Amino acid sequence: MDTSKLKPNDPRVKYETKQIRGKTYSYILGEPAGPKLETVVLVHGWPDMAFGWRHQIPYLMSLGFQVVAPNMLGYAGTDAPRDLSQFTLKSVSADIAELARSFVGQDGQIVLGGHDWGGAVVWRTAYYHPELVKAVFSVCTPLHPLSAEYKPLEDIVAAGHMLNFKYQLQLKGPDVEARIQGKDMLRRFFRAMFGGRGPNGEAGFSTSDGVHFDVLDKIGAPPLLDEQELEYYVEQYALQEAPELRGPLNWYRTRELNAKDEMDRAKNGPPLRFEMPALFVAASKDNALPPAMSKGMDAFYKDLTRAEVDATHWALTQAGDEVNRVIGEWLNKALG
Ligand SMILES: CNC(=O)c1ccc(O[C@H]2CC[C@H](NC(=O)Nc3ccc(OC(F)(F)F)cc3)CC2)cc1
Numbered sequence: 001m002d003t004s005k006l007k008p009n010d011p012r013v014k015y016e017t018k019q020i021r022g023k024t025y026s027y028i029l030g031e032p033a034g035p036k037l038e039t040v041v042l043v044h045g046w047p048d049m050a051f052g053w054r055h056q057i058p059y060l061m062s063l064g065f066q067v068v069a070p071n072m073l074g075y076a077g078t079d080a081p082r083d084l085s086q087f088t089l090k091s092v093s094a095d096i097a098e099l100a101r102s103f104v105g106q107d108g109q110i111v112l113g114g115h116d117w118g119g120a121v122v123w124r125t126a127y128y129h130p131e132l133v134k135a136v137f138s139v140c141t142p143l144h145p146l147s148a149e150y151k152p153l154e155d156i157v158a159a160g161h162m163l164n165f166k167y168q169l170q171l172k173g174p175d176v177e178a179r180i181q182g183k184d185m186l187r188r189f190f191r192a193m194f195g196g197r198g199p200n201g202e203a204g205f206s207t208s209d210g211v212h213f214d215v216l217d218k219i220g221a222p223p224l225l226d227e228q229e230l231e232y233y234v235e236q237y238a239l240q241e242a243p244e245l246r247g248p249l250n251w252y253r254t255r256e257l258n259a260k261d262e263m264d265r266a267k268n269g270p271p272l273r274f275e276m277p278a279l280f281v282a283a284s285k286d287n288a289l290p291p292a293m294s295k296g297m298d299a300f301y302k303d304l305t306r307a308e309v310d311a312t313h314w315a316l317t318q319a320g321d322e323v324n325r326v327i328g329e330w331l332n333k334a335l336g
Contacts, residue, residue: 001033003062005320006054008232013057013067017077020099023086026050026077027070027099030061037064038111038134038335041100043125044069045116045141047193047248049076049236051229052115055320056327063328065111068103070096072118074247076236087250090261093125097132109134111331115316116140116289117251126274135334137279137327139315140286142294143301146266150259163208164288170210172252177243179213186234186244194222194230194314207287224314274301277334281326282308283315305330 006013006028014029028050040060044052050069060067073092074080085091100110112133114122119141126133157166170176180189192204192211198218205211222230237244278301282291291308298304307326311319 001058001062003058005317006051006057008051008228010054010058012061018099018102020095020102021091023073023079023081023095024077025070025079025095025099027068028053028057030057030067030069032064032066033062034064036066039066039068039100039104039108040111040113041096042067042069043096043112043114043118043121044072044075045114045118046251047190047237047245048116049233051232051236052316053113054229055317056113056324059324059328063331066103068099070099071236072121074240074250076239078247080240080247080250084250084253085257087254088257088261089121089124089254090128090258092121093128096121096125097129100132108132112136113327114138114141116313120144123274126276126278127270127272130276133276135277135279135331136274137281137330139281139323140283140289140313142280142282142289143272143297146269146272147259147262148266150256150263153255164290165207167205167207167210167288168252171249172255175213176211177245177249180211180245181243183234183238185216186237187230188216188219189245190225190230190233190237191219191222192216194224195312196220196222224312224318272300274304277303277305277330279305279307279327279330279334281315281323282306283313283319284308284310286311286313286315288313303334305334 016029017024017026042053050071053069057067071078104110109132112122119138122136122138123143126136156162196204196219198215202215204215204219240247309315309319309322315323
């Protein structure tokens with residue numbers, strides 16, 4: 001079959017929805033070449049969508065995998081509930097668990113892949129539902145411990161800590177949600193998020209201040225999306241009701257809710273312990289999730305495979321062929 005990356009509305013895959021835990025969940029479904037080895041569920045992050053796995057979906061299909069890549073909660077054709085507790089890692093993990101079992105049955109198992117916020121989802125999903133996750137990998141996103149304590153992010157960065165996360169203050173606030181509405185602003189927003197630059201090298205986004213609205217006017221062609229792919233992101237993000245980015249930005253408004261769930265797990269529940277085979281693909285030039293952030297991550301895993309790729313945060317695409325290689329070979333050993 002054709003293993004080249006998915007094009008917008010590629011006919012090699014199917015585009016379906018299912019009711020999942022009260023929400024409409026849109027997803028990409030790719031059927032395997034040959035008898036199904038495993039079902040692989042891929043979870044994207046912010047500000048991405050299922051199409052963000054366009055390099056991995058046809059590749060994993062050609063390896064004999066069924067591939068389910070949902071548009072996560074708040075993105076594209078998937079519902080964006082008003083309630084913030086729907087956006088916790090626990091609830092979203094339960095969404096992935098019910099969606100995965102809608103294909104492999106309640107007794108079945110899956111391979112689970114995540115990137116950015118999706119990588120955090122799949123670690124938590126492997127933690128909450130070990131019966132389901134036969135193998136799990138995450139690109140860029142390392143494991144983070146069960147929250148033992150809640151502190152406002154303002155106070156954390158005010159003390160000089162977690163400075164690589166200070167962009168989240170703007171994202172969770174009203175500025176990005178109010179100003180990035182309609183396709184015209186979405187097109188500039190995506191040009192900024194995927195590497196576009198201004199006449200004097202102005203970046204449209206930074207990990208310190210977030211979106212630079214002052215710059216989106218002069219933001220140029222992004223090096224990491226072609227014109228067809230950029231228009232697809234705009235079209236799919238336009239499927240959300242205005243303000244279109246409320247759903248995606250809701251993922252940055254759940255620090256306290258996630259803290260309340262995991263402060264319970266830290267006290268009573270089982271520890272962060274991964275017995276199934278695991279892979280972590282770090283990205284060298286990811287300024288949001290730097291490789292050094294994964295320092296003592298190996299201690300939580302019985303079987304963690306480490307790899308690192310010289311790429312930006314957008315390693316699934318910028319280094320799609322290399323990421324495909326790391327996944328396929330690790331998957332080949334992890335499954336036998
Ligand atoms: C030791 N581990 C920890 O402390 C820890 C790890 C993960 C975690 O959850 C993370 C939070 C961040 C979220 N992703 C995100 O914000 N991505 C993002 C950023 C910036 C962008 O713009 C860019 F600059 F990249 F172009 C585009 C996407 C993933 C899960 C919490 C704690």
